[PDB]
Design a protein around this ligand. Structure first.
Ligand SMILES: CC(C)CCC[C@@H](C)[C@H]1CC[C@H]2[C@@H]3CC=C4C[C@@H](OC(=O)CCC(=O)O)CC[C@]4(C)[C@H]3CC[C@]12C
Ligand SMILES: CC(C)CCC[C@@H](C)[C@H]1CC[C@H]2[C@@H]3CC=C4C[C@@H](OC(=O)CCC(=O)O)CC[C@]4(C)[C@H]3CC[C@]12C
Ligand SMILES: CC(C)CCC[C@@H](C)[C@H]1CC[C@H]2[C@@H]3CC=C4C[C@@H](OC(=O)CCC(=O)O)CC[C@]4(C)[C@H]3CC[C@]12C
Ligand SMILES: CC(C)CCC[C@@H](C)[C@H]1CC[C@H]2[C@@H]3CC=C4C[C@@H](OC(=O)CCC(=O)O)CC[C@]4(C)[C@H]3CC[C@]12C
Ligand SMILES: CC(C)CCC[C@@H](C)[C@H]1CC[C@H]2[C@@H]3CC=C4C[C@@H](OC(=O)CCC(=O)O)CC[C@]4(C)[C@H]3CC[C@]12C
Ligand SMILES: Nc1ccc(Oc2c(F)c(F)c(C(F)(F)F)c(F)c2F)c(O)c1
Ligand SMILES: [Ca+2]
Ligand SMILES: [Ca+2]
Ligand SMILES: [K+]
Ligand SMILES: [Mg+2]
Lengths: 490, 160, 160, 159
């Protein structure tokens, strides 16, 4: 019996985009049923439409995968069946879903282990159930295969002693001395007597327990102080949170906090429903977004600043970019700002209704990848106290920290620098599992990488689950699911 | 003919200028005069279309900066359209009735005058419909049936 | 009902046709009889040197009879097209790529000064989004709203 | 409206007379900066850049390069009743006054704000005046006349 909360999922998608850009537009494309579209001219649409063709399904596993570890099973599935198995649910007295599994930790219990796959359609997913080891070893083709309290009470979020609001408020001069790098700045346009968006759902995923303390990102709010105190009661238990009263439209405030040294800059509005005019909606968000693009610094220009903004009327997505070719007939999923991960409208979540009916476990696979890992036990505590009570540390609690997280890799240097120009995505995927046990499931490629003429725009788009023989350019980023490391240098 | 040449030059899209009511009435009015002069004969053909030139009055009066207010513009438009279409329909009935039926070898010829045809069209538009005069040929009846669809609504709307 | 359903059509649909060796400008915003009359009377005055730029209006409300009469009076040097400046199709219809400038008129006698400024800001944003090198001249009602135009990425005050 | 006595005397003003600026700024590129400089007392690019950032003004410390921005011609009126120009009040040659002021004081005269009933034989006591813009060279002057002028800033002052 499922309730689909729109605000929670939207804010979780945005927060996940904060850790790795483009993740919201990748995830929102896994729940819309779309077919393969092939085009001839060599544009970025050619690869984007191949990427968006995939959806996420689920089906049981054949008996050939009984006594095998998850990395080996995933590598076998990829290489042989051309399927990407992202996660499984571990049948027990009560069901539980594991996102990514290190070898030895979990062997397949064989009790009808339900696996989650990314593929073009269910027909291809059906191969995993019919896979016979002895019969299908020779068949290379995927076809022809036939029959002090620091953590939370539950130990899943970071926690700190309550702090009053006046101890975190900054001023324009005061914020100058503080040096902020790789933080998150949030712009809110709310005010008194306006709809109350739940800001807890935005910062809670960013404070998950699987991150080390030093890896946490500082959070700065820029908005009316009167609105903020209306919901500070649910925010004062999180570490490294600050407030800068003012207006995001003021170019002076945006310089006090080093907006040119950030990871994201979220733009939200609270009174979007009150407006009756269709055109005058999104006036604040569009104007604030354009303000940052025009700012000048002694990274030397505001165009390269990473920004995400929500919209209440998706036909206004045309105003977010200058070099795009606007058309009032193309759907939101195909325009450039959505393909780049710099926009998000709630209308793209309408497709989640039908996806939940056909396989109920989807809504619980997401909402743990997206939310920091909230459990029904925790939701009971918030219902009564509404204060996110903290607790002490026990070996059972400290064992909940070990779960995979979303990260973004770079091929410029490191172990994988050699494969930057060779161009075999399958080689990178296979090496990642057997060495560091990280799962790669996408490319975030420069918009003008295929063109021969050099360019200066640094916009990128998402390619979801590229084929095995895909070519790699050295200037691109890789989406990964990284195992939690219990010990790490500070 | 000369005035048609000037209008042709000043037009933007020649195709949509060609497919215009004034151009059509010029096409169906001017050449037959020269043809009749060459042949030393005559025929009362589609001459009733000359009443369709009354529509341009409301526009040339605005060109002359005579009409400036909305009420007068609307009144002139309504009057011109009503009178022009009434006279055109009367002329068509006159031609069809006085000529006959081509496939009948012209034996249905009913003697009517233009004033009588005008009276007939007025009675038909008013939906009064006496039995004193009426169309008796096939083409006349067909045109009357098709004119009843539009002229009745036009009369019901314009006169009040 | 059938007569009404048929004939529901836009008489001012179409596309502007550029002329080699002649500039043109696009005027949008608060289009009305008095505003258009004043603007034309000041723009086409004889004291200015000889000019041959065309004026292309663009409004989403069909003009009334006396405004149409005004356009008839200025027949050979003023054109009207129906559409919205927030539509890329309309912006391409009025050939805004080669337009020398775009003028935006404002409603001084408006009830709420802020909404008019917001609408003008939207119009400017749309025009600059379609073509980021056109020259824009606009009217602002309040001073604190004029600072928002300084933050548009393509708004260059050094240029005109 | 432009012919009414209250407007011709400068005792009334309506925003409807500013609608002509749309066509004025299109034909001539730099008019809008000329007006704003002449009217708002300074529209230099330095102010334009600064006003975009803070949307306010900040105090500063006087420096020799800063105090060089205080040399701008200002608007002022003059009277022919007394002074170096009293000789030309009865004389009546507008051109002679124009050249003499510009050569000596670098002062530009570009109008006369004349008494309304100065052209009538009968006497009166009305003190209403109207504006005459750029009179010709051979224009008669009367002692009860005020001339519009632009005057240079003078660093020294009696104080
Ligand atoms: C609006 C434009 C396209 C003009 C359309 C006119 C046609 C509808 C008319 C004009 C000439 C008519 C024709 C004139 C004469 C005859 C001969 C007539 O046969 C005769 O020989 C008449 C006596 C007999 O029936 O024996 C049959 C009808 C027909 C073809 C007529 C059919 C209808 C036509 C083609
Ligand atoms: C499209 C508009 C502008 C004009 C429409 C004209 C039609 C109503 C006319 C054109 C051709 C005519 C036909 C041409 C010839 C004949 C044959 C004619 O019969 C004969 O010639 C011999 C047999 C007999 O006596 O019936 C009967 C009428 C009929 C069908 C005519 C009926 C009326 C028609 C269809
Ligand atoms: C709708 C309102 C404006 C009234 C419309 C009036 C028409 C029906 C009148 C106006 C002029 C009249 C015509 C003026 C002169 C003549 C010529 C007249 O014949 C002659 O003078 C020659 C001898 C003959 O053939 O009898 C026959 C009537 C007729 C066609 C008249 C028929 C009826 C007309 C067209
Ligand atoms: C102010 C406007 C409406 C003009 C008014 C005058 C016309 C309506 C008159 C002028 C000449 C008249 C015509 C003069 C003679 C005749 C012949 C007449 O036919 C006859 O031979 C007599 C028949 C009969 O008396 O019953 C039929 C009416 C008609 C066409 C008249 C119809 C009415 C007409 C066109
Ligand atoms: C709307 C378009 C398709 C025209 C519809 C009518 C036509 C298709 C023509 C073709 C043959 C015609 C018919 C041919 C012969 C006759 C017999 C005729 O009988 C008579 O007594 C003759 C009277 C007369 O015409 O003077 C009545 C008209 C009628 C049914 C005609 C009516 C009009 C018709 C159906
Ligand atoms: N004197 C004469 C000679 C031939 C005729 O034949 C026509 C005809 F059959 C016809 F259908 C039309 C129509 F297109 F208008 F409908 C005509 F115009 C006609 F002229 C006629 O009516 C009268
Ligand atoms: Ca598919
Ligand atoms: Ca755009
Ligand atoms: K009857
Ligand atoms: Mg023209």
């Amino acid at each position: 019996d499922d309730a689909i909360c729109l605000a929670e999922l939207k804010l979780g998608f945005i927060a996940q985009s904060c850790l790795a850009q483009g993740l919201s537009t990748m995830l929102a494309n896994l729940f819309s049923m779309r077919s393969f579209i092939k085009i001839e001219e060599d544009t970025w649409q050619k690869y984007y439409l191949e990427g968006v063709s995939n959806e996420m399904y689920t089906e049981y596993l054949s008996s050939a995968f009984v006594g095998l570890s998850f990395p080996t099973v995933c590598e076998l599935c990829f290489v042989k069946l051309k399927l990407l198995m992202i996660a499984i649910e571990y049948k027990s007295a009560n069901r539980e879903s594991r996102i990514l599994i290190n070898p030895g930790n979990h062997l397949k219990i064989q009790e009808g282990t339900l696996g989650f796959f990314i593929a073009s359609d269910a027909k291809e997913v059906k191969r995993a159930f019919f896979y016979c080891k002895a019969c299908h070893d020779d068949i290379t083709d995927p076809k022809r295969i036939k029959k002090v309290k620091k953590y939370d009470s539950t130990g899943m979020f970071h926690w700190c002693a309550p702090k009053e609001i006046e101890k975190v408020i900054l001023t324009r001069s005061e914020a100058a001395m503080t040096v902020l790098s790789g933080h998150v700045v949030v712009c809110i346009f709310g005010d008194v007597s306006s709809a109350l968006i739940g800001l807890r759902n935005l910062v809670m995923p960013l404070r998950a327990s699987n991150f080390h303390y030093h890896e946490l990102k500082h959070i700065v709010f820029v908005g009316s102080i009167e609105y903020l105190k209306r919901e500070w009661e649910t925010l004062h238990n999180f570490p490294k949170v600050s407030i800068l009263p003012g207006t995001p439209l003021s170019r002076a405030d945006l310089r006090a906090v080093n907006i040119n040294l950030c990871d994201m800059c979220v733009i939200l509005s609270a009174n979007q429903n009150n407006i009756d005019d269709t055109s005058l909606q999104d006036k604040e968000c569009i104007l604030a977004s354009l303000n940052i693009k025009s700012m000048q610094f002694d990274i030397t220009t505001g165009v390269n600043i990473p920004i995400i903004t929500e919209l209440v009327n998706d036909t206004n997505v045309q105003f977010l970019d200058q070099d795009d070719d606007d058309d009032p007939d193309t759907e939101l999923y195909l325009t450039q700002p959505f393909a780049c991960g710099t926009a998000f409208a709630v209308s793209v979540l309408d497709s989640l209704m039908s996806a939940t009916y056909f396989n109920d476990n989807i809504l619980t696979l997401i909402r743990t990848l997206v939310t920091g890992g909230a459990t029904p036990e925790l939701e009971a505590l918030i219902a009564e106290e509404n204060a996110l009570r903290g607790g002490y540390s026990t070996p059972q609690t400290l064992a909940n920290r070990d779960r995979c997280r979303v990260a973004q890799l770079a091929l410029l240097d490191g172990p994988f620098a050699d494969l930057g120009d060779g161009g075999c995505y399958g080689d990178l995927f296979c090496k990642a599992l057997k060495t560091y046990n990280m799962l790669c499931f996408g490319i975030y490629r420069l918009r003008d990488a295929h063109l021969s003429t050099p360019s200066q725009c640094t916009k990128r788009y998402v390619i979801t689950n590229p084929p095995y023989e895909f070519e790699l350019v050295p200037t691109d980023l890789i989406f990964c699911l990284m195992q939690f490391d219990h010990n790490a240098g500070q | 003919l000369l005035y048609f040449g000037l209008r042709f030059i000043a037009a933007n899209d020649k195709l949509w200028f060609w497919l215009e009511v004034n151009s059509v009435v010029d096409f169906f009015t001017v050449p037959p005069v020269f043809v009749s002069v060459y042949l030393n004969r005559s025929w009362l053909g589609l001459r009733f279309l000359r009443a369709l030139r009354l529509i341009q009055f409301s526009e040339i009066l605005q060109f002359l900066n005579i009409l400036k207010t909305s009420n007068s513009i609307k009144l002139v438009n309504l009057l011109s359209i009503f009178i022009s279409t009434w006279l055109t329909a009367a002329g068509f009935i006159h031609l069809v009735e006085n000529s006959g039926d081509p496939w009948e070898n012209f034996q249905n010829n009913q003697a009517l005058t233009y004033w009588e045809c005008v009276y007939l069209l007025m009675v038909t538009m008013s939906t009064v419909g006496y039995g004193d005069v009426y169309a008796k040929t096939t083409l006349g009846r067909l045109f009357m049936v098709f004119f009843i669809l539009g002229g009745l609504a036009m009369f019901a709307s314009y006169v009040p | 009902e059938i007569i009404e359903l048929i004939g529901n059509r836009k008489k001012y649909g179409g596309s502007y046709s550029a002329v080699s060796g002649r500039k043109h400008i696009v005027v949008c915003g608060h289009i009305t009889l008095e505003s258009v009359s004043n603007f034309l009377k000041d723009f086409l005055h004889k004291d200015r040197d000889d000019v041959n730029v065309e004026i292309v209006f663009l409004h989403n409300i069909s003009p009334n009879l006396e405004l149409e009469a005004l356009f008839k009076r200025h027949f050979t040097q003023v054109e009207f097209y129906q559409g919205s400046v927030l539509n890329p199709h309309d912006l391409a219809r009025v050939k805004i790529e080669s337009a020398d400038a775009c003028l935006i008129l404002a409603n001084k006698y408006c009830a709420d000064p802020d909404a008019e400024d917001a609408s003008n800001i939207m119009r400017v944003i749309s025009i600059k989004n379609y073509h980021p090198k056109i020259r824009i001249i606009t009217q602002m009602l309040q001073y604190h709203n004029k600072a928002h135009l300084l933050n548009i990425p393509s708004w260059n005050w050094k240029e005109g």
